């Protein structure tokens, strides 16, 4: 009925806005536009909280946005993303990564491993060796478990190992994944309609 049809239209539009915001968040992440990312993050969060129902596809979209936000805050060790205050931002990203309904291909495994490694490295670069060991215990598996344990034990913050499995390396692999999400939803309604309006003026 009238009110019901309006409510359905609102649900449809909310779904469109979620997709569009995800796309915008991915681009800001890719381009390194930190302030735009923060603002788009707040918008996406508001739209998500306003949803009264979700489809599996939307849940995946939500996870993707949550994942990127945790990654963007990877070095902000004082940021609490989970109810359990002990969980660091990268550990939170790791949990989300392991929940997303996606294929565990090579890129997936590469990202997973790099996040596990950097979750420990960011703590060590802050001189927080006790916290690094605590992160290790919570996370640990991979073939580098023993090496990480040793690196932590010896407080070897700038071990060559980290030079290879660096934060930048982690970021570039995730940006590769973002390019995939980007191409996958660059055709969602809102973005497509807006692009059409922009072109319809040229």
């Amino acid at each position: 009925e009238d009110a019901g049809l309006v409510a359905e239209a609102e649900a449809v539009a909310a779904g469109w806005m979620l997709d569009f915001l995800c796309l915008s968040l991915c681009r800001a992440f890719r381009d390194g536009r930190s302030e735009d990312f923060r603002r788009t993050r707040n918008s996406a969060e508001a739209i998500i909280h306003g949803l009264s129902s979700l489809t599996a596809c939307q849940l995946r979209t939500i996870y993707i946005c949550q994942f990127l936000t945790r990654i963007a805050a990877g070095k902000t060790l004082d940021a609490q993303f989970e109810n359990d205050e002990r969980i660091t931002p990268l550990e939170s990203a790791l949990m989300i990564w392991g929940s997303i309904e996606k294929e565990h291909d090579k890129l997936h495994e590469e990202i997973q491993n790099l996040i596990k490694i950097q979750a420990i490295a960011v703590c060590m670069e802050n001189g927080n060796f006790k916290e690094a060991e605590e992160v290790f215990e919570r996370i640990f598996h991979m073939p580098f478990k023993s090496k990480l344990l040793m690196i932590i034990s010896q407080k070897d913050t700038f071990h060559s190992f980290f030079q290879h499995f660096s934060y930048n390396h982690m970021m570039e692999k995730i940006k590769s994944y973002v390019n995939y999400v980007l191409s996958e939803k660059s055709s969602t309604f809102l973005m497509k309609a807006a692009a059409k309006v922009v072109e319809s003026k040229r």
Binding site: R41, N42, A44, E45, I48, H49, I62, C65, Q66, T69, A73, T76, L77, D78, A79, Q80, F81, E82, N83, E85, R86, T88, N126, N128, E131
Partner: peptide, 13 residues
């Protein structure tokens, strides 16, 4: 809790 994108608060470091 919640589908939070932003932090829930500050963490004890």
């Amino acid at each position: 809790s919640h589908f939070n994108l932003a932090p829930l608060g500050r963490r004890r470091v």
